[PDB]
Design an enzyme around this catalytic site. Structure first.
Site, PDB file in Angstrom:
ATOM      1  CG  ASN A  35      12.062  -4.850  60.126  1.00 14.60           C
ATOM      2  OD1 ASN A  35      11.993  -4.508  58.940  1.00 14.60           O
ATOM      3  ND2 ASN A  35      12.416  -4.005  61.097  1.00 14.60           N
ATOM      4  CG  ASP A  38      15.140  -2.940  56.160  1.00 14.07           C
ATOM      5  OD1 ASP A  38      15.325  -2.029  55.313  1.00 14.07           O
ATOM      6  OD2 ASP A  38      15.620  -2.874  57.334  1.00 14.07           O
ATOM      7  CD  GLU A  88      13.446  -1.002  58.330  1.00  9.43           C
ATOM      8  OE1 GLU A  88      14.359  -0.415  57.693  1.00  9.43           O
ATOM      9  OE2 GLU A  88      13.680  -1.969  59.093  1.00  9.43           O
ATOM     10  CE1 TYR A 122      11.043   1.016  61.297  1.00  4.46           C
ATOM     11  CE2 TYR A 122      12.084  -0.784  62.450  1.00  4.46           C
ATOM     12  CZ  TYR A 122      12.154   0.252  61.550  1.00  4.46           C
ATOM     13  OH  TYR A 122      13.343   0.518  60.903  1.00  4.46           O
ATOM     14  CG  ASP A 154      13.200  -4.282  64.759  1.00  7.84           C
ATOM     15  OD1 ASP A 154      13.818  -4.089  63.679  1.00  7.84           O
ATOM     16  OD2 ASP A 154      13.783  -4.268  65.868  1.00  7.84           O
ATOM     17  CG  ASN A 192      15.310  -1.382  66.136  1.00 13.57           C
ATOM     18  OD1 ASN A 192      16.290  -1.833  65.555  1.00 13.57           O
ATOM     19  ND2 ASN A 192      14.240  -0.949  65.499  1.00 13.57           N
ATOM     20  CG  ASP A 221      12.313  -8.907  64.688  1.00  9.82           C
ATOM     21  OD1 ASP A 221      12.365  -7.682  64.971  1.00  9.82           O
ATOM     22  OD2 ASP A 221      12.472  -9.354  63.526  1.00  9.82           O
ATOM     23  CG  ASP A 237      17.495  -5.696  57.475  1.00 11.26           C
ATOM     24  OD1 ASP A 237      18.013  -4.580  57.572  1.00 11.26           O
ATOM     25  OD2 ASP A 237      16.286  -5.904  57.547  1.00 11.26           O
ATOM     26  CG  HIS A 238      15.023  -7.475  61.144  1.00  7.25           C
ATOM     27  ND1 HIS A 238      15.519  -6.430  60.420  1.00  7.25           N
ATOM     28  CD2 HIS A 238      15.104  -7.117  62.437  1.00  7.25           C
ATOM     29  CE1 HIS A 238      15.932  -5.491  61.234  1.00  7.25           C
ATOM     30  NE2 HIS A 238      15.701  -5.894  62.474  1.00  7.25           N
TER      31      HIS A 238
END
Length: 273
Positions: free
Chosen positions: A26, A28, A54, A126, A165, A167, A238, A263-264
């Site tokens: 990811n 981001d 993302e 995602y 991801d 989530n 993930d 961030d991932h």
């Protein structure tokens, strides 16, 4: 507290050597991640397939540094049309896939790429986040049901690899703050059980948690804020989910906790196929 990922096991239980390196990530923001040296890292990891979540970037603005990746020449990109700088996923592969789909029927979102290969079917996702203060939770619940039914129709064919991801942190061992979070997006009991439904309906196994069932403090995401990545205050969002059919090929499923850019962090899967 913090985590050092085991070394790469590149042989299967049957003693065969892996022939397929798949990496998800990811980013981001695909443009930012690229400027923060992401492509240089992907080049070193040298995967046969790269999956990205993302992207936050239309195909209009896809940087042509991506065309500078010849080991991942076949590139496919999904983008929501309504909102720019939202969501988006991408699949880059050494070999061209046989069939390329987008979405899961109900189409506009840019979250799911589905790529049929010779021996298996790869899906990147995602998954919608429930939102701060659970503003989108009741949407994620219908998403979880839809994703499941769509996916069980694909596993009626070839085996499945699902990465991306998702989530959701499944169990308490999947995050560092289990008790301060079960009313927060990513560890509510609806999301947690929807992910078990996923493992059940299709069915599927969590590659990493199969081989590392007791291993705690292994996260793939840390909030940017409060130097949480410094403190391994992170989550495992993930995943590499695998058809049961495929576990005898499962060589190893990694967490690349040291690759920066987002961030991932990246994850990497080895299959002896």
């Amino acid at each position: 507290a913090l985590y050092e990922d085991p070394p790469d096991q590149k042989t299967s239980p049957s003693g065969k050597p892996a022939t397929l390196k798949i990496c998800s990530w990811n980013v981001d923001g695909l443009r930012a991640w690229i400027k923060k040296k992401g492509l240089d890292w992907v080049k070193e990891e040298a995967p046969d397939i790269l999956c990205l979540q993302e992207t936050k970037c239309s195909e209009n603005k896809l940087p042509a540094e991506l065309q500078e990746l010849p080991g991942l020449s076949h590139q496919y990109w999904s983008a929501p049309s309504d909102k720019e700088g939202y969501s988006g996923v991408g699949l880059l592969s050494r070999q061209a896939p046989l069939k390329v789909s987008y979405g899961i029927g109900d189409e506009q979102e840019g979250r799911v790429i589905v790529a049929e290969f010779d021996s298996f079917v790869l899906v990147t996702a995602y998954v919608p986040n429930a939102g701060r203060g659970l503003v989108r939770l009741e949407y994620r619940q219908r998403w979880d049901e839809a994703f499941r039914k769509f996916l069980k129709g694909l596993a009626s064919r070839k085996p499945l690899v699902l990465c991306g991801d998702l989530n959701v942190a499944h169990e308490e061992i999947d995050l560092r703050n289990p008790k301060g979070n079960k009313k927060n997006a990513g560890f509510t009991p609806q999301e947690r059980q929807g992910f078990g439904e996923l493992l059940q309906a299709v069915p599927l196994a969590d590659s990493f948690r199969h081989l590392y069932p007791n291993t705690p403090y292994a996260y793939t995401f840390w909030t940017y804020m409060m130097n949480a990545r410094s403190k391994n205050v992170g989550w495992r969002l993930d995943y590499f989910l695998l058809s049961h059919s495929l576990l005898p090929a499962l060589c190893d499923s990694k967490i690349r906790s040291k690759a920066l850019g987002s961030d991932h962090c990246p994850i990497t899967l080895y299959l002896a196929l």
